[PDB]
């Protein structure tokens, strides 16, 4: 049959394949090429000191056990092929609770080219820690990070790198800005080495620079405070003998100020 040719290609690829071992376990390091397409920078929760981000998480690595010779150079396969091969165990260091979307079918991608180069895209919604120093609140700016790296494989086993230039390896979509309080100024990346109890690991960093707006606070706090002070400023213009009127000016301004 016409479809038996690709079936036996996949069955020949998975024959004798150990998915528990990374490519070149005892011979080299598995370089993983990573880039991120942010489809929406979600709302920043100031109470939890966190932010939400939806991203296309793309990783690419060379595997030599997945070489084939056939009529099609790229095998655009589904998600069931992804669990049958080795994939890197990338996790977010400062993530709190993230969901990999699986509606309707697991939101994953797998493309095996003929030289063995892979590509593995995912949809995630990362709730990551953004520690905030609110000394200049509400006129503050933050650099909320997004740190990801391998969980089990050390620096001598799996290293991470950006597939494009580092200035162009985190792309934020134009319509994708769900920020209502802040506004996104730009991105900032950097690789690095983190020392842990187990060993040294390669952690890739993505700093999102934010800047809050006083819009909500120059109408809820600052302006009702100015109007409260000004309404106590008109009590000097009343009569001296009007004791209860200037008294109710004083007590109502003190109550409005303390309830604000």
């Amino acid at each position: 049959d016409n479809t038996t040719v690709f079936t036996r290609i996949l069955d020949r690829l998975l024959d004798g394949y150990d998915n528990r071992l990374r490519p070149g376990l005892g011979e080299r390091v598995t370089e993983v090429k990573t880039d991120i397409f942010v489809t929406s920078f979600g709302p920043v929760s100031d109470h939890d000191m966190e932010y939400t981000i939806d991203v296309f998480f793309r990783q690419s690595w060379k595997d030599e056990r997945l070489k084939f010779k056939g009529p099609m150079t790229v095998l655009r396969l589904n998600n069931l092929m992804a669990s049958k091969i080795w994939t890197p165990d990338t996790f977010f260091h400062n993530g709190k609770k993230s969901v990999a979307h699986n509606m309707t079918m697991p939101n994953k991608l797998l493309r095996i080219t003929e030289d063995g180069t892979l590509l593995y895209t995912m949809r995630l919604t990362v709730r990551a820690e953004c520690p905030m120093h609110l000394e200049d609140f509400p006129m503050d700016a933050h650099a909320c990070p997004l740190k990801f790296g391998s969980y089990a494989y050390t620096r001598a086993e799996v290293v991470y790198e950006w597939t494009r230039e580092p200035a162009r390896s985190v792309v934020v979509a134009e319509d994708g800005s769900r920020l209502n309080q802040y506004d996104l100024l730009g991105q900032t990346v950097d690789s690095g080495i983190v020392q842990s109890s187990t060993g040294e690991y390669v952690v890739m960093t993505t700093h999102f620079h934010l800047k809050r707006k006083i819009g909500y606070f120059v109408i809820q706090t600052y302006l009702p405070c100015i109007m409260t002070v000004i309404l106590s400023q008109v009590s000097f213009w009343l009569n001296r003998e009007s004791v209860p009127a200037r008294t109710v000016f004083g007590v109502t301004t003190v109550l409005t100020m303390t309830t604000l």
Partner: antibody, heavy 116, light 105 residues
């Protein structure tokens, strides 16, 4: 592991020159190939970028049009085209492999071009 | 573009003491600089990648360092065979290079 380039060239100004370097010991489809200009007693100047697996090329804005980068798969070779050669184009050219952490790992021996 | 402003042009000291270099970036490059050596009549060779990562074959005397904007390369007890020109480059964006720091006796 070795990047062997072409020889030295000497043509009249206003002409065109073919310049090439052959990579051995690996394949150029994995890493980017970077071209750089070294004027004598001056600093290095980056020419452009090529990704041979995708075929995409990115160039410096001051080198757009006068220079372009091509490649092929079977010979595992990166090429330059230079057009409208002038006196300030007299320099030595290296092709540099993209390395670990974007570092320009390997370098060629160098081809010196000269006009008269 | 990103502008590399490594200084000075050349330094002229003897053999066996500490000499440091400096590379200053116009815009942010985060730990993606690289340092090369340039002997007369010789192709460049890599020394440091990242910010301070020592390449294979580099002696231990060559110590680099870096930050978000300021970068440096410290030499401990420079010898006679190290008399060459040094280059600072970046690759956080499309790659650029500095002018060049030389060494003299």
């Amino acid at each position: 592991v070795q990047l062997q380039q072409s020889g030295a060239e000497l043509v009249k100004p206003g002409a065109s020159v073919k310049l090439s370097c052959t990579a051995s010991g690996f394949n150029i489809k994995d890493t980017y190939m970077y071209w750089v200009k070294q004027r004598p007693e001056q600093g290095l100047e980056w020419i452009g970028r090529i990704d041979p697996a995708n075929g995409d090329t990115k160039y410096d804005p001051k080198f757009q049009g006068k220079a372009t980068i091509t490649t092929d798969t079977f010979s595992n070779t990166a090429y330059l085209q230079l057009s409208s050669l002038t006196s300030e184009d007299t320099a030595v050219y290296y092709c540099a492999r993209k390395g670990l952490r974007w570092a320009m790992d390997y370098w060629g021996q160098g081809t010196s071009v000269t006009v008269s | 573009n990103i502008v590399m402003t490594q200084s000075p042009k050349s330094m002229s000291m003897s053999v066996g003491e500490r000499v440091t270099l400096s590379c200053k970036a116009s815009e942010y490059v985060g730990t993606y600089v690289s340092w090369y050596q340039q002997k007369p009549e010789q192709s460049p060779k890599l020394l440091i990648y990242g910010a301070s990562n020592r390449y294979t074959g580099v002696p231990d005397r060559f110590t680099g360092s870096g930050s978000a904007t300021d970068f440096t390369l410290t030499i401990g007890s420079v010898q006679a065979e190290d008399l060459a020109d040094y280059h600072c480059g970046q690759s956080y964006s499309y790659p650029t290079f500095g002018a060049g720091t030389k060494l003299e006796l």
